[PDB]
Amino acid sequence: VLYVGSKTKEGVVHDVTTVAEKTKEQVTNVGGAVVTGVTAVAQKTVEGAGSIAAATGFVKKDQ
């Protein structure tokens, strides 16, 4: 691997705006998962079998 004057952006996240208003949120959960917020993952490598890279709102009931 050789980079020579090579401006690079390997695996990034940027410029992520969010606006809400008057969001009268009622939420009720029992045993489950709820995700309502901004999430920003940025990885270069996730190696290994069985991996779970960057889940969100995940539920796992493996027997």
Place this chain on the structure above:
Amino acid sequence: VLYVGSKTKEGVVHDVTTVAEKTKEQVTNVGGAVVTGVTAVAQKTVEGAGSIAAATGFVKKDQ
């Protein structure tokens, strides 16, 4: 691999705007998963068998 003066953007995310308003959200969950928010994943590599790269609102009941 040789980059020579090569402006690169391998695997990126950007410029992601979001606006809501008056969103009278009621949510009820039982055992499941709900996702209502902004999500931004950006990976360069996810290696390995059985992998789950960047799930969202996932449910897994493997026996």
Place this chain on the structure above:
Amino acid sequence: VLYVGSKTKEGVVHDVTTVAEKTKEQVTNVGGAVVTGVTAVAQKTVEGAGSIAAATGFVKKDQ
């Protein structure tokens, strides 16, 4: 691996704005998980089998 005058941004996150207002949030949880806030993960490497890189709102009831 050889970088030579190569401005690089391997695995970053930036410029993530968020605005809320009057968000009369009621939340009720029983045994589960709720995520309503800003999350920003940025990794270069997550190695190893069975890994869980950057979960959010995760639920795991493995038997």
Place this chain on the structure above:
Amino acid sequence: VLYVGSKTKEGVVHDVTTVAEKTKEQVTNVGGAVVTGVTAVAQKTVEGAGSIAAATGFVKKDQ
């Protein structure tokens, strides 16, 4: 009267949202009545002849 494990909601009011905006309201009244606001009455009993239960914007010029 016998209630036995009986979750009851006799005569209620709830969950009443209201939003206005830029409502350049001019109002002129002479001797009369004007009602422009949110009203929420909730009674269980109003007993007695001649009663007036929960009027609003009422005018009475009985001779």
Place this chain on the structure above:
Amino acid sequence: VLYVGSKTKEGVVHDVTTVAEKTKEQVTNVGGAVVTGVTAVAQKTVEGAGSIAAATGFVKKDQ
């Protein structure tokens, strides 16, 4: 009257949101009545003839 483990809500009011904005309200009254605000009455009993339970913006010129 017998209540036995009976979760009851006899005659209630709740969860009453209100939002205004830029409401350039001019009001002029002469001898009358004007009501522009949030009102929330909640009674269990109003007994007696001739009663007036929970008026609002009322005008009475009985002779």
Place this chain on the structure above:
Amino acid sequence: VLYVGSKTKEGVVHDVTTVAEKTKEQVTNVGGAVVTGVTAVAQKTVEGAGSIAAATGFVKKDQ
């Protein structure tokens, strides 16, 4: 009357939010009544003839 482990809410008011903004209110009154504010009455009993339970913006010119 017998209550036995009976969680009760006889005649209540709660959870009453209000938001205003930039409300350039001019008001002019002559002899009358004006009501522009939040009001929250909660009674269990109002007994007696001729009663006036929880008026608001009331005008009475009985002769």
Place this chain on the structure above:
Amino acid sequence: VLYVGSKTKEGVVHDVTTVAEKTKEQVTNVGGAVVTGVTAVAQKTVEGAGSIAAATGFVKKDQ
């Protein structure tokens, strides 16, 4: 020139309202000119040859 009780408004500017909102403005310039703001010029006289009275967003590459 004779003004005699002559209410005059020679060369004026007034009453100029402006409202913006959520204006996610990205701007990129190279060597040029960009104008995005409120401008209000008001002159009575601009005398002289070759004059440039009240330019805006001007570019001049005279050789």
Place this chain on the structure above:
Amino acid sequence: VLYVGSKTKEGVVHDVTTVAEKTKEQVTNVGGAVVTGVTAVAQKTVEGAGSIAAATGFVKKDQ
């Protein structure tokens, strides 16, 4: 020139309102000019050849 009881407004500017909000402004410039703000010029006289009266966002590369 004779003014006699002559209320005059020669060359004025007034009453200039401006409102912004949440204006997530990114700006990038290289060698050029950018103008994003309120400007209010008011002159009575600009005399002389070659003059530049009240420029804004001007660029001049005269050779």
Place this chain on the structure above:
Amino acid sequence: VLYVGSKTKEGVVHDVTTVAEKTKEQVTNVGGAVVTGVTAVAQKTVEGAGSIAAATGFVKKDQ
């Protein structure tokens, strides 16, 4: 020139309001000029050839 009881406003500026909010301003400049603020010039006379009266965001690369 004769003024006789002549209320005059030669070359003025007044009544200039400005409101901003949450203006997440990033700015990047290289060699150029940026103007984002309120400017208020008010002159009665600018005499002389070659003059530059009340520039703003000006760039001049005369050779």
